[PDB]
């Protein structure tokens, strides 16, 4: 699809048998989601944003569905105020910025 | 053109007749630039992201050229880690997300 940006680009994702709303975010290197449980090992990480840094849990090779794209990648879990889909998954769905 | 997301979608912009690199950021409602001078009246605003808020100066009706497209709009200035082009201007150059 072509998504115009008059609104926040929020879409449905499916992860860990849960449906969630998330933000398609070209300004994020990584995908970060609000507090949740994922299976398997993780490693602590710090990520930075506009107003400073937060600590997150890094989970690798997590399957996630984004607008009917079934993909697999790294998912960060921590106190982001909005679920964020970053470049690591946007590339996986063939997402480009066009003008 | 069509910009891929393997790397940060950074572009050259010209503002106050100064050339800078800025990030095309679909996860930002607004455009915020690192500390600089802009002419005219401004008012203070808080903006927040991952990890909290920063205080910025809101300047309106500011000309800015983004990858060769000349637009005029609201530009925020403050302690952002990077120059950010937000949806308020992305929409003005006809930028869409496409997959």
């Amino acid at each position: 699809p072509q998504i115009t940006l008059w609104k926040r680009p929020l879409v449905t994702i499916r992860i860990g048998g849960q449906l969630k709303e998330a933000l398609l975010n070209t300004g994020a290197d990584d995908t970060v989601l609000e507090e949740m449980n994922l299976p398997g090992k993780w490693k602590p990480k710090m990520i930075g944003g506009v107003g400073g840094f937060i600590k997150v849990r890094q989970y690798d090779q997590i399957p996630i569905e984004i607008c009917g794209h079934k993909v697999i990648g790294t998912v960060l879990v921590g106190p982001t105020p909005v679920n964020i889909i970053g470049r690591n998954l946007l590339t996986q769905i063939g997402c480009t910025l066009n003008f | 053109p069509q910009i891929t997301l393997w790397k940060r979608p950074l572009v050259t912009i010209r503002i106050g007749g100064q050339l800078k690199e800025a990030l095309l950021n679909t996860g930002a409602d607004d455009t915020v630039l690192e500390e600089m001078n802009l002419p005219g009246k401004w008012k203070p605003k808080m903006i927040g992201g991952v990890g909290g808020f920063i205080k910025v100066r809101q300047y309106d009706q500011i000309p800015i050229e983004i990858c060769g497209h000349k637009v005029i709009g609201t530009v925020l200035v403050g302690p952002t880690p990077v120059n950010i082009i937000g949806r308020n201007l992305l929409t003005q150059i006809g930028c869409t997300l496409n997959f």
């Binding site: 990584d30 990480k45 944003g49 | 952002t80 990077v82 950010i84 937000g86």
Partner: peptide, 10 residues
């Protein structure tokens, strides 16, 4: 509300 979601892997 928060509205600028830049995110950096440092």
């Amino acid at each position: 509300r928060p509205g600028n979601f830049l995110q950096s892997r440092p």
